[PDB]
Design a protein around this ligand. Structure first.
Ligand SMILES: [Ca+2]
Ligand SMILES: [Ca+2]
Lengths: 457, 66, 457, 66
């Protein structure tokens, strides 16, 4: 049963928060041996938080909006008393975190109940959650296939029914990709909306944080709970709260909605195109629109990511290169060796790019693209082919996500189920101008109401 | 850059920054680097004049209210 | 004639703008063959602007605050109809500028009269104005010695009595150094105060623009005239005008004024220390204060400068390295080849540095240091000794300026005349918190009233 | 970090980015680079956590007034 029903069951007294917690714990116990989404279970904490909700309810209090809702978080998020792994072996010996990540604090204040931490590609550098140290996370819809990444555990935990809400990070696609491949909902908010404080970073210039969920209501509820300024967070630009929940069902009448072409069709396979097509038809979108400099946008993001990510880890690459993830360590090293001219040109190009994307959205409210070029490939896949072009599997999963995060535009990834496709899901990106998260969510809600976007529960 | 130029650069740059690379690892690093070099070439196709500034410029302190 | 005399003399009708202009023109004609401050004389324009002021006076109009004041500008400033050289031969094939630099527009609107463009180290990369293409600018107090740089023409033109006001740029010292060595006044405002639009840049992250002058009043008057937001200028963060002229004579009663030690004494020679000592006594300053991480501040500025400056010129360095200034071309190339890790660490350290400097100024209003380690060396000097320690002459001229501009603190460079120093001047930096230009100017005024800071024939 | 390592890096890096360097020019560039390498080493001594961010972080568009 989904987020909204869980919340209502506790709120109305038909079930206790504690019982809902014990069910999720049992489900994780019975399923995670195979799925491998969790790297730690905060059992004692979850039971205490759930009991605390039951006590508030018994006292007659008005319960907060996520009261008793179970969740879990990508293990780059600080959890009080737990060592933040960020998918690494290297971090195991660091001191446990003194406090929760700010977003975890805000979910807690909203009454949500924390079940633990989730597997990821090491240090966030990847799109497949094939972690050499911790094992791959497996796609619940077909356990020989990848969950996507780097927030693989965040996607897989929801698709397996372990929890209804999770948190992930997205720099070049790492929320949108696992949402797409696992068939669940994802929201990458505007760059600078949600506080990054108390998280292990990857690329200072591009990291975003945000929720995945079992429904679009879950996205909106978790997003509103986490909203607000944080003056101690260098990357935060949001000066006030702009609630999405009260207008979630307002619809799309009168909005200008377009379908992205060029880059976003050339790097889309047959299933991806079919998903966009049906989402476009349902949303009344028929004009094909070109995104400015999409390929160059990807290139600049790619350049800045590798140098910032790589250099962040320079001291460790010098002294303990062998303790890094073998699938990405050489990518980090390539990043450190990139000429400084590449970095500076990419940063200068980003100004031009920002001007062009903001100008594009003076004419459009929502733009539609596929989230991944294909559905989930088999674990261990080295190469994929997209419309007759070979790409390495691991970078290529983000071809369609990478340009959009570079401009910082909010995106909802809506889960769809196209027909020529072995029963596997693929997601669609609903993209809006900076600060227009509620338009993304309004569009997702229309997709959900019609049965086009859904989970296979 | 040619494959030979990439090889000489990976070797010299990795030594300079303190990450010495064994032969198989140097080859793997060059493979990733070569792919990134193409993306970097694509950046050069967008014209920038000297007054085209960085996306973000320093702020020494917030401007005082009044 | 001094600034305030010129302005009042024009305002009251005792002398015409045209006559004041012809005097400056004649002085340039008689002196500049030797001093070599000017690279272009805008004779027709100067006569037209001066006549325009005399006409407004004759019409009964209220004259603007710089009415009839002659000035000139570093040749990185765009002058309408003139090709912007920025000290180079490479720029001579570029089209003439379509418009004046914004600061030039604002001086014109204030009634000031433009006499032309001034010599500089090529592309601003230097501290001595020893230009191979255009010749050295020579120190008017001893023409075998350097004027300092990169704004050498800006300092020398004032010291030779050619003009009472000039404009320069300061990235790592390039205003403060020639002010110090020529014995004139300089103001480097807060980073982001004055609009950079219509100027040839060096380091996007650190360039500042501002005036040099024959008096502290000239600094304040020119500064107020140039003040104001410019939304088309990416680097500007000044949202309103904060007039300095009305409070220039308010004094320093109650202010906390300190003397910088450590770095700022070890890299100060005997004359520099004597200048600080007498300026400190006159301002009531006796406590020694440590600037945070001064040496590292310099290092980070040095790193960012070389890579940003060098990469800005990459296309030309690829095809025509031999047409650059031989004294700096290999420094630009070194910059391009610096590891990206150096650049990113410097940018990360800048955040820490900014926090420490802003925290330091919670306890202090004004802090005092020497502007240069020594007075002007002989043209052609490659090495200097400061308190028995070798430094290369050309970078070393900015040892005391480079840390302070990296934090973006406003600085007035006040000209003083220490003993047993061959009669040569040396400047003192009066440094304040970001946005506190008027405290710097208030302190300079007390130095001027007492005769401690002054110009000489 | 040796003289011969610095020289090999200057040569390979300059070829990689497209700046042709004669032997005497490469030596002059190495002289400046070596001085900068010391400043960079000094910078490396300052403790920075992974969460110690860049002085300026991207702003995708101004936050809308209301
Ligand atoms: Ca990535
Ligand atoms: Ca400099």
């Amino acid at each position: 049963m989904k987020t909204v029903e869980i919340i209502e069951g506790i709120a109305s007294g038909r079930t206790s928060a504690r019982d809902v917690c014990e069910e999720a714990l049992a489900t994780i116990g019975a399923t995670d041996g195979l799925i491998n989404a969790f790297t730690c279970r905060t059992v004692e904490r979850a039971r205490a938080e759930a009991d605390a909700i039951d006590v508030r309810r018994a006292r007659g209090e008005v319960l907060p909006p996520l009261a008793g809702l179970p969740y879990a978080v990508k293990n780059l998020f600080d959890i009080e008393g737990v060592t933040t792994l960020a998918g690494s072996k290297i971090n195991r010996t660091l001191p446990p975190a003194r406090a929760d990540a700010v977003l975890v604090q805000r979910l807690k204040a909203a009454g949500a109940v924390l079940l633990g931490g989730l597997n990821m590609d090491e240090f966030a550098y990847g799109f497949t959650t094939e972690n050499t140290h911790y094992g791959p996370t497996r796609n619940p819809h077909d356990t020989g296939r990848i969950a996507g990444g780097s927030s693989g555990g965040s996607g897989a935990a929801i698709a397996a029914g372990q929890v209804p809400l999770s948190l992930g990070s997205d720099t070049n696609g790492s929320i949108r990709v696992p949402a797409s491949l696992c068939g669940v909902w994802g929201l990458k908010p505007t760059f600078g909306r949600l506080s990054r404080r108390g998280t292990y970073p990857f690329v200072h210039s591009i990291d975003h944080l945000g929720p995945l969920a079992d429904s679009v209501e879950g996205l909106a509820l978790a997003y509103d709970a986490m909203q607000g300024p944080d003056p101690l967070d260098p990357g935060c630009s949001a000066s006030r709260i702009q609630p999405s929940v009260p207008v979630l069902s307002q619809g799309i009448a009168g909005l200008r909605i377009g379908v992205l072409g060029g880059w976003f069709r050339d790097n889309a396979g047959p299933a991806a195109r079919a998903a966009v097509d049906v989402a476009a038809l349902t949303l009344g979108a028929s004009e094909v629109v070109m995104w400015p400099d999409a390929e160059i946008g990807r290139a600049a993001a790619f350049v800045i990511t590798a140098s910032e990510g790589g250099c962040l880890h320079l001291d460790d690459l010098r002294i303990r290169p062998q303790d890094f993830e073998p699938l990405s360590v050489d990518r980090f090293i390539s990043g450190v060796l990139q000429p400084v001219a590449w970095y500076l040109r990419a940063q200068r190009f980003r100004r031009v790019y920002r001007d062009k994307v903001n100008a594009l959205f003076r004419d459009w409210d929502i733009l539609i693209a596929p989230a991944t070029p294909i559905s989930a490939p088999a674990i261990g896949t080295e190469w994929i082919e997209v419309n007759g072009t070979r790409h390495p599997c691991r970078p290529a999963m983000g071809l369609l996500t990478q340009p959009v995060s570079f401009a910082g535009c909010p995106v909802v990834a809506a889960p769809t189920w196209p027909g020529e496709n072995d029963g596997m899901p693929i997601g669609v990106q609903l993209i809006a101008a900076p600060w227009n998260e509620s338009l993304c969510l309004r569009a997702g809600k229309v997709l959900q109401d019609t049965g086009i976007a859904r989970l296979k529960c | 850059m040619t494959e030979t130029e990439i090889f000489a650069y990976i070797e010299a740059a990795s030594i300079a920054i303190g990450i010495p690379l064994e032969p198989a690892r140097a080859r793997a690093v060059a493979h990733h680097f070569s792919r990134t070099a193409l993306l970097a070439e694509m950046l050069e196709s967008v014209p920038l004049s000297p007054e085209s500034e960085l996306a973000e410029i320093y702020r020494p302190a917030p401007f005082p209210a009044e």
